[model samples]
Target: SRDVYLSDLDWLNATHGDDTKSKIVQKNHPFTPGNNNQSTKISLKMEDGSISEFEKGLGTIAGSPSTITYDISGAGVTKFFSYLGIDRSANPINEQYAKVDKIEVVVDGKVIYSTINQFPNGLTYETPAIKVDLNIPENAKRLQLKSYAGEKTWGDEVVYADAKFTAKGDF
Candidate 1:
């Protein structure tokens, strides 16, 4: 199947967030933690201390003032999938990365999904990334992902990892 990028889709609006490295990035060009001001893929330190990469995703900082809206009405996207949380590439352990207090996806002004996104602790206990798999409502047009840190977090680095939007049979 041909690749249809979410980055290619129209981002109707944004409030306060950083999407500098969000390519939805080219699937072949995933972000590596050896990174910077450039956008990066969703990478995290798993419970086993192994680095795991989502390979692709939409990038965003934590605690956005308002929801970022995406227009899928014209996108023909029937399925939305990804993982959401903070990345390990962020500030080192001393400084630590901030975790998302809340993330909600609204379809046509209705909350279709919501969760408290937690960052992995890289230890005995780890807050697993939130799994997002949604069937786009056929009648819905606008989609807004409302999220925020709620308060100041250590290092601000968050994402919907491996985020993919697929049209029926487009995969």
Candidate 2:
């Protein structure tokens, strides 16, 4: 049983233009304040199921549907223990702007794990984390983790504090 953290994977490439492009930014680093070590793009999924892109920043002002994706194929990892949550960099100034309404974990384009949440709300000033056991398909070559907003109002940015996975054996 080998635990592989998403933050430790070596992401070779990232793209955010077209649907065929990759959106995994900063590889294995947490999205933090003033951390511009790599090209990170924040994307929003509109209420109409449309996606828009924005430069990854400390405060992501979104009032519509939104989602972000990452490709974990480069790591050649399969089975995983999913861990999701908000980082500690959150403050009152941006706490009201953070919202993680839903989350989806896709393996080889198939929806494997999905959940709806309402934690670390507008009034929340601390970090919140969630854990789950996930089994990646043997044929799975890529893993996409999408995070969506719950409301259509201005919300704070979401920082993946320690959100990662522990890779096990193949399916």
Top candidate (lDDT): 1
* TM agreement with the true structure for every prediction: 0.69, 0.53
How many pairs of residues collide in each model? 4, 6
Please list the C-alpha lDDT of all candidates, in the order they appear.
0.57, 0.43
Residue ranges of candidate 2 with Cα displaced over 4 Å: 12-24, 27-29, 34-78, 94-96, 117-127, 150-171
- RMSD of each candidate? 5.4, 10.0
Clashes of 1: 4
Span of ten consecutive residues with least summed lDDT in model 1: 23-32
Q: Which candidate is the best by TM-score?
A: 1
lDDT of 1 by residue, 55-126 (tens): 556555554443567776655667777666566666535534454567787899887777732332221113
